[PDB]
Design a protein around this ligand. Structure first.
Ligand code: A1IS2
Ligand code: A1IS2
Ligand code: CA
Ligand code: CA
Ligand code: CA
Ligand code: CA
Ligand code: CA
Ligand code: CA
Lengths: 102, 114, 102, 114
């Protein structure tokens, strides 16, 4: 619904599957794992998702480790003010980029 | 210098000048560690020293919100926040590079064995 | 079908709508404009899209100009060997990133 | 130096060392212009001179394919290819920064008025 996360792997050129994503609000707010498409839907509802400051934390360290690759970061963490959001994240072992589509 | 940060601005085509950078450390058991502002080349040298930079989990937070607001631009992110374990197999030098846009950032690390 | 392009704007946090995308093969091969979602489907067919070397050129200069913003690049150009492809591009006035999902 | 290129490797956490960079120029009417390889810091200074770097449309191509293949990694892109108009309102200095991964790259420009 109102909040979606999508994660891609820049080394293998694939979606990042079964990655843990935790969302906090300024406080745990929503969480899940990415699908076979790298996407995570169903995180929250329009009633629950009010304006405020949110942190999306993607567990990139566990992802790389599962592949046998040593990663730099503990996570990709993404902190923004909410005022239809997709958080996109593009992962490499020593880098990440992230954007918001609103 | 064991921890350097370099920040560029994708909207202006320039270094990101005078952007605040805060570093925190999480101990084996989330403490302020060091902070500074980027120079006219967008670089921040002198945050810390070999003697102070111990093993741990470090968070580097770049104050993107203040930077964009001071330029008259609408920032999405509160800050850009790079979290990594440092020095776990021995002392290393770390450069944290960040490229900023109002609704996106990218960051990478360069790690060298002194 | 086999080739899709998606374009996002990192300054406004929106899809990049009505952007011209030209695809070449090593020679014009396919082209179109992005939709309201920043997406361009229907570029080619599975019969047409053989293994080879392709260039996706996104007309980022015309996009920024339409918004009243002076851009650095003439285009975002993306050259790869084909051997289900999404080319994703994330645009700012002086920067772009691009990835492939295969 | 009016045209500098800096390249980092997102897989290894290092500069991208000894990567070939070719520059071409399109005239008012797609000519080789200059070329070099990145240093041990991932930087390429000395591509050109004030006197040679005229107005025009320039293409900087970074040979990502050779670089990844030499490291035993599967590259998607043939090369990373930055195309821009230069010097149109007067001489400027340009830094082209690129961050490489096997299936992705990002690039930005820093533009300064000497
Ligand atoms: C976040 C990001 N960085 N560089 C690029 C390219 C992207 C990107 C662009 C377009 C669609 C996407 C979907 C998921 C993940 N990332 C993306
Ligand atoms: C972190 C990052 N994302 N996309 C690119 C391009 C860079 C980059 C590459 C090379 C040198 C740099 C120096 C400072 C900041 N960023 C960079
Ligand atoms: Ca909940
Ligand atoms: Ca200063
Ligand atoms: Ca240790
Ligand atoms: Ca065709
Ligand atoms: Ca050298
Ligand atoms: Ca002119």
């Amino acid at each position: 619904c109102p909040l979606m996360v999508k994660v891609l792997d820049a080394v293998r050129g694939s979606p990042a599957i079964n990655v843990a994503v935790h969302v906090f609000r300024k406080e745990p707010f929503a969480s899940g794992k990415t699908s076979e498409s790298g996407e995570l839907h169903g995180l929250t509802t329009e009633e629950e998702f009010v304006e405020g400051i949110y942190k999306v934390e993607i567990d990139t360290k566990s992802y790389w480790k599962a592949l046998g690759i040593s990663p730099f970061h503990e996570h990709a963490e993404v902190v923004f003010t909410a005022n239809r959001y997709t958080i996109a994240a593009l992962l490499s072992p020593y880098s990440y980029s992230t954007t918001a589509v609103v």
